[PDB]
């Protein structure tokens, strides 16, 4: 608007799209990013309750645009007369940019947005910076997960460090796929395509990461307090038992689903122990968890134990006195899912007025590029 | 007078000022608001933001605002500015599950009791529009299960699993004004232990605490089937009665002399406390099981205008039934 109170910020993901206005602590709307065609186009929430009678397609993968003919139809649904009702000609937008994205894709979304939509202001922001802007910090380490891949990225004052960014190729999709394989060995057959969103509710409702594996197995072998009954839309009742704490442990032991690596706990260690010595303490104290695939119960309480044990037998071998002076702390507020949005809700509020943050429309009328 | 809402248990219940609407939580991650259209209860609204079991609700009447807390380490403040309720965010900084929530008499702070050996007193800040918390943690060794507020908007009673009942002060200088002198004490900084009780040898977990209308008397129930009343006017003195029934899960003052209790026996009871320092059992109030409630009663509240003049009281519990009891 004239005073600037029509800035809209949206987080685009592979599984869920979260759009809202600045100055609010909550997303205005969340919806899954499904577009499909029957066997005209059913886009958005309608592609969730019915998908056995519909062919689906996911138009993104870790920020990489799979098809440049479906994102337009999704963005029309977002910026259309069913969710946000915006007058598109008078608005400014703040978008996310995942770590390590290629140049052509970065300047293709900026190119297509000024042309077929006629906004008035565009900015693209790195998610690692936004996650810490919502926490009050400026230097830290972001361990973000979701449905793509799990990134671990440090950040110094305002600017990320792409040289020291690491990635692990397991996320919520691999865990919910592994749960199908585990449930297959009980007499319960769920096909890969049409029942993907039925086992996802089972994963969301009944799964947790164990603190001590030993007591978990003792309770699983000599006690029946882990088995729970889940009702299905058809009316059947299935029973899920010891499979609750086996599916989430592909993260800490990645070889169980044929992925070569070191796991999230050890990859974090290998990332913190690869920078200059002076700033290593600045990263130990401030580790922030973000994303929807870090809301399992116990995942906060396991990484602390793993890092303390990995730092007491690799760096300070033996001599268990100085660990008390060594302070390690992990921050994980109960608002982990939308921390990309909330950061975007702050950065658009502070810098709403001064007209250098945004990329002006007139800049691409003459130059066609940007340096900010 | 019994009414059966749902077959599932009721975790917690809240009333409003006119006793027209009721907020319930049917053992799930949702809150249901019901109103009364004539002579039948019909559901009105649903509130759903938690992703965990909801454990406590309360309704500030004069401001008309609902505070909700649950086991997902979250708390929300629901307000009605349009036809649809909307939430507001609360920063609590706890790492274990919350267990109890309660508003203050002046409706400017609220106290949350949690399982991290903490008590969180939260107050409002408008420069960026959320609630910010302060912690009381010094003498507590275990999880808190009950809370109550003094009429003078400073002192705070607490019961915990470490077999102690404590009285703290929660004076926040940014919001509150300076208090007067009470029999409980004189010097009242924030987070300072004012009094402590719980020495009886075979002490059990304290499930419920409550203050009187005068503010100079405290009462609490324990899991060893005992009720106790502590007086502070004549002197810091206690009187404990050892009942021969199952444990009691809630307590509330009706007047300066009588106290009403409920628990797993499914039947509310009335005790009398004389001015000389003696507790005496009086009677039950409900003279399949031979009792209207079919399971343990979890919460006791007052239908009338509270401790100044109380006539009727409400009971709810695990059976799914809600009952109104009248003394007359």
């Amino acid at each position: 608007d004239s005073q600037g109170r029509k800035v809209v910020v949206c987080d685009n993901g592979t599984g869920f799209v979260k759009c809202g206005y600045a100055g609010s602590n909550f997303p205005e709307h969340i919806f899954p990013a499904l577009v499909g065609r029957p066997i005209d186009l059913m886009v958005g929430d309608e592609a969730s309750e019915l998908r056995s009678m519909l062919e689906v397609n996911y138009p993104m993968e870790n920020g990489i645009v799979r098809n440049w003919d479906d994102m337009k139809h999704l963005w029309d649904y977002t910026f259309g007369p069913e969710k946000l009702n915006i007058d598109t000609r008078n608005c400014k937008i703040l978008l996310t940019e995942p770590p390590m994205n290629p140049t052509k894709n970065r300047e293709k979304i900026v190119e297509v947005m000024f042309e077929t939509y006629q906004f008035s202001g565009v900015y693209v922001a790195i998610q690692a910076v936004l996650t810490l802007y919502a926490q009050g910090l400026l230097t830290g380490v972001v361990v973000d997960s979701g449905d793509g891949v799990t990134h671990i990225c440090p950040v110094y004052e305002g600017f990320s460090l792409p040289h020291l960014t690491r990635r692990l190729d397991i996320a919520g999709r691999d865990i919910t796929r592994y749960l199908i394989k585990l449930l297959l060995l009980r007499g319960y057959a769920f096909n890969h395509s049409a029942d993907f969103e039925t086992v996802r509710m089972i994963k969301e409702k009944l799964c947790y990461v164990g603190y001590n594996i030993e007591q978990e197995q003792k309770l699983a072998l000599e006690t029946t307090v882990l088995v729970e009954s889940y009702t299905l839309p058809d009316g059947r009742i299935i029973k899920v038992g010891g499979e609750r704490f086996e599916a989430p442990e592909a993260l800490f032991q990645p070889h169980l689903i044929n992925v070569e690596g070191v796991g999230v706990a050890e990859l974090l260690f290998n990332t913190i122990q690869a920078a200059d010595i002076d700033t290593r303490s600045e990263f130990y104290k401030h580790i922030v968890l973000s994303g929807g695939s870090t809301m399992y119960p116990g995942l906060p309480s396991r990484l602390e134990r793993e890092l303390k044990q990995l730092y007491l037998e690799r760096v300070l071998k033996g001599d268990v006195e100085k660990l008390s002076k060594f302070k390690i702390r992990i921050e994980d507020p109960p608002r982990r899912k939308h921390m990309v949005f909330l950061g975007g809700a702050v950065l658009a509020d502070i810098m709403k007025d001064k007209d250098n943050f945004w990329m002006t429309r007139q800049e691409y009328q003459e130059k066609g590029v940007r340096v900010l | 007078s019994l009414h059966q809402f749902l077959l599932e248990p009721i975790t917690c219940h809240a009333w409003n000022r006119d006793r027209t609407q009721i907020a319930l939580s049917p053992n799930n991650h949702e809150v249901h608001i019901y109103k009364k259209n004539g002579g039948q209860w019909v559901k009105a609204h649903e509130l759903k933001e938690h992703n965990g079991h909801i454990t406590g609700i309360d309704w500030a009447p004069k401001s008309d605002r609902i505070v909700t807390c649950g086991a997902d380490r979250n708390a929300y403040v629901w307000s009605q500015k349009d036809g649809v309720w909307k939430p507001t965010l609360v920063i609590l900084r706890i790492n274990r599950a919350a267990t109890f929530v309660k508003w203050s008499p002046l409706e400017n702070k609220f106290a949350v009791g949690s399982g991290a050996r903490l008590i969180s007193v939260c107050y409002f800040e408008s420069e960026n529009d959320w609630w910010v918390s302060k912690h009381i943690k010094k003498p507590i060794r275990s999880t808190v299960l009950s809370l109550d507020w003094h009429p003078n908007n400073v002192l705070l009673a607490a019961g915990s699993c470490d077999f102690k009942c404590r009285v703290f002060s929660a004076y926040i200088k940014e919001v509150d004004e300076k208090p007067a002198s009470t029999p409980w004490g004189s010097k009242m900084p924030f987070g300072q232990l004012m009094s402590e009780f719980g020495g009886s040898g075979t002490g059990g977990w304290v499930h419920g605490v409550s203050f009187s209308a005068s503010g100079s008397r405290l009462a609490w129930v324990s899991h060893d089937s005992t009720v106790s009343v502590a007086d502070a006017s004549k002197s810091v003195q206690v009187s404990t009665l050892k009942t021969e029934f199952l444990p009691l899960l809630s307590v509330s003052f009706v007047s300066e002399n009588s106290v009403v209790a409920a628990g797993h026996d499914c039947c509310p009871m009335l005790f009398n406390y004389d001015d000389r320092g003696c507790l005496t059992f009086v009677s039950k109030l409900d003279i399949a099981l031979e009792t209207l409630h079919q399971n343990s009663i979890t919460q006791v509240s007052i239908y009338e205008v509270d401790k100044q003049d109380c006539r009727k009281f409400c009971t709810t519990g695990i059976d799914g039934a809600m009952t109104i009891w009248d003394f007359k």
């Binding site: 009050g136 400026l138 | 920063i91």
Partner: peptide, 30 residues
């Protein structure tokens, strides 16, 4: 050898308040 950033210094931005506002958030959250 290299600075803390582990990159060449960006002279364009060197040639050319958020921190004030972020302190209240840092106080309230932590």
């Amino acid at each position: 050898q290299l600075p803390v950033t582990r990159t060449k210094i960006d002279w364009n931005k060197i040639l050319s308040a958020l921190m004030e506002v972020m302190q209240k958030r840092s106080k309230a959250i932590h």
